[PDB]
């Protein structure tokens, strides 16, 4: 029964990284602002105890049972040696190093837009869901940016309902309200409970 042979134990970062998903595709105006405000809130309120790191490169290729060492050296000139897998694999233990310092860390990943994309990996992070209540509000919110976002409005909508159709149980926390301050406290109290839990 060694085809998969999942170990009973998995190695995960000491402190859970925080990943924000929604309300639509990242790298666009609306999602960028709705996450940057919360990022700012986390930097300020929890100043001196939380470090913010941005994952510019991809992070969805975190595999552990593929091979002993795919692309161990950059001089092999192999398909995966010169590929993007090397830096993504090397970014994995950076999160571990941040976690072993007891300081809570977040992940500003611009590629992951669905929890299942980063659920089978070794990170096992806290996933935060910022969502619009209805797509009718979201369409007009995208309209509020300008003519630039009308070009990408189409693709910006299926990324919403695909993530909505994901079961709520996949996400760790849900920010289902519209007010900035009350949703802001919704995360603050949860993270205070987490802080007291591991202390």
């Amino acid at each position: 029964k060694q085809a998969e042979h999942v170990p009973p134990y998995d190695v995960v970062p000491s402190m859970r990284p925080v990943v924000l998903v929604g309300p639509s595709l990242k790298g666009y105006e609306v999602t960028d602002m709705m996450q940057k405000a919360l990022f700012d809130f986390l930097k300020h309120r929890f100043d001196g105890r939380i470090s913010i790191t941005r994952v510019t490169a991809d992070l969805s290729l975190a595999k552990r049972s593929v091979l002993n060492n795919p692309g161990k050296r950059t001089i092999i000139e192999r398909s995966s040696a010169r590929s993007s897998i090397a830096e993504v694999q090397s970014e994995i233990e950076r999160i571990f190093e941040l976690a072993k310092s007891l300081q809570l860390v977040v992940l500003d990943a611009d590629t992951i837009n669905h929890p299942a994309q980063l659920a089978k990996t070794s990170l096992a992070p806290i996933i935060v869901f910022v969502k619009v209540s209805s797509p009718k509000v979201l369409q007009r919110l995208i309209r509020s940016r300008g003519k630039s976002q009308m070009k990408h409005l189409t693709v910006q909508m299926m990324a919403y309902d695909k993530l909505v159709q994901c079961p709520p149980e996949s996400f760790d926390v849900i920010l289902d309200e519209n007010q900035l301050e009350d949703a802001c406290e919704h995360l603050a109290e949860y993270l205070e409970v987490y802080w007291r839990a591991t202390h």
Binding site: S133, S134, K136, V137, R140, L141, S144, E177, N178, L180
Partner: protein, 48 residues
């Protein structure tokens, strides 16, 4: 001739208005108005 007649007219008109307000067309229009008003609060919060 005045007070009783006016009371009867007001009562009949109020009953007629109450019956007419709960028709399917008026109810649908009110539901559309309520949904449009509910969207606006969420929009204002998100723009803030």
């Amino acid at each position: 001739g005045s007070f009783f007649m006016l009371n009867l007219v007001l009562g009949v008109l109020s009953g007629e208005f109450a019956k007419e307000r709960e028709r399917v067309e008026n109810r649908r229009a009110f539901l559309k108005l309520r949904r449009q008003q509910q969207i606006e609060r969420e929009l204002n919060g998100y723009l803030e």
